[PDB]
Amino acid sequence: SLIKKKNKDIRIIPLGGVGEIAKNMYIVEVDDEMFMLDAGLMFPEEMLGVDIVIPDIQYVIENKERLKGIFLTHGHEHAIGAVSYVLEQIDAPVYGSKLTIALVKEAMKARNIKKKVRYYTVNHDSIMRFKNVNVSFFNTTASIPDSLGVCIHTSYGSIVYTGEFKFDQSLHGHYAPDLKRMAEIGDEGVFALISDSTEAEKPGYNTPENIIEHHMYDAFAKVKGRLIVSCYASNFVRIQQVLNIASQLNRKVSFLGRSLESSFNIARKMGYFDIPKDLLIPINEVENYPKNEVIIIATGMQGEPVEALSQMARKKHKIMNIEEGDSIFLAITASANMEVIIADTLNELVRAGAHIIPNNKKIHASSHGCMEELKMMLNIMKPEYFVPVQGEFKMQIAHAKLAAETGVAPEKIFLVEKGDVISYNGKDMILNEKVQSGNILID
């Protein structure tokens, strides 16, 4: 009764999501308990013959008896696309919001994996208790609803992992952030913040979605023929905007691609979308309408939209191809991994006689916090140590500069590569070890 248990050693190890924006996976150890935070995929970067890339988890396998859980922040492919592959190697519980869990189950069914999985749905009131720590959660604002940040409580203070977030006052309901809970976490004491760097190079605030939606309306109103929208199947913000605008322009909407069809059906049943009746049509009926009465939302059979758009542009798609006069709206976050395929696909679309709605100040990728939003998270959390993740190295550097601006000690900011081990022993935080890391190519 007189002795309280107290934590001694911490390790933080990125296995994916640094040096890239995708395949996020962060291992946190507190003494003899290990936690996996996200388990994403990345679509192939000239990688020929690859469908997806997932993190090498050999370090976790070597230590698997200590893995107490996989905690999933949100249902983007870059956060959950590797989960089924992880579960074929190791049997640990999977914690996530009601939507994230439903999406993981759909992935397991799609790969016909029959193994018993221990899912545990959490929300912002859940506190998961382990031997060494407790884990709590808080709502964030992502491009998919029901996203959660993760807070691992230790005797040194909390280890906070944000996942994807932005601060946008126009997003409410299942996108509303837990600002008061975040402030309480910061006030109680944050030992380490692990935060999203994807848009850390961009000044200001990301554009609010109400303004993006109005600009999408203006652009789509000018489209004289068919409109093809290319986005991730997880981009529920964009999908909802397209549905709203379609109804206002007297266009029908149809989906092209397996992951979109499944994610939408799941989410619609769960009540996540506002859908006018008679808006949606099956893809086989699109040819029956005048061109200026249709919007097609297209993603890869796997959820990678640019490859499907390239197939359509080159008249190689199995179901539906681009025709001269089509207009295209491509909604995707830029990365080093995607820039060649994006450039080539845009060229192919122009050669096919399609019109490209610009990627400019009026409309552009608007998820992930820009500099001021990242500073806001830093100022709320007031971390002792800071580990920028979810980005290429230049994005991590930009984010580290923001942390120093908000007052994090520069010697307490760690710039990590895949397989690096940050460790703390109650005295010093060090980066003095590496573990195995790398890319597993799935065909």
Curated annotation (Swiss-Prot):
Gene Ontology terms for molecular function: 5'-3' RNA exonuclease activity; RNA binding; RNA endonuclease activity; zinc ion binding
Keyword Cell membrane: no
GO annotation terms (biological process): rRNA processing
Swiss-Prot/TrEMBL keywords: Cytoplasm, Endonuclease, Exonuclease, Hydrolase, Metal-binding, Nuclease, RNA-binding, rRNA processing, Zinc
Top enzyme category: hydrolase
Keyword Cytoplasm: yes
Cellular compartments per GO CC: cytoplasm
Enzyme Commission code(s) on record: 3.1.-.-
Binding of Zn(2+), residues: 74, 76, 142, 164
Domain of life: Bacteria
Location(s) in or outside the cell: Cytoplasm
Cofactor: Zn(2+)
Cofactor: record remark: Binds up to 2 Zn(2+) ions per subunit. It is not clear if Zn(2+) or Mg(2+) is physiologically important.
Binding positions (substrate): 364-368
Known function: An RNase that has 5'-3' exonuclease and possibly endoonuclease activity. Involved in maturation of rRNA and in some organisms also mRNA maturation and/or decay.
Assembly, per entry: Homodimer, may be a subunit of the RNA degradosome.
UniProt family annotation: Belongs to the metallo-beta-lactamase superfamily. RNA-metabolizing metallo-beta-lactamase-like family. Bacterial RNase J subfamily.
Official protein name in the record: Ribonuclease J 2
The species this protein was found in: Staphylococcus epidermidis (strain ATCC 35984 / DSM 28319 / BCRC 17069 / CCUG 31568 / BM 3577 / RP62A)
Organism lineage: Bacteria, Bacillati, Bacillota, Bacilli, Bacillales
Part of the whole protein covered: 2 to 445 of 557
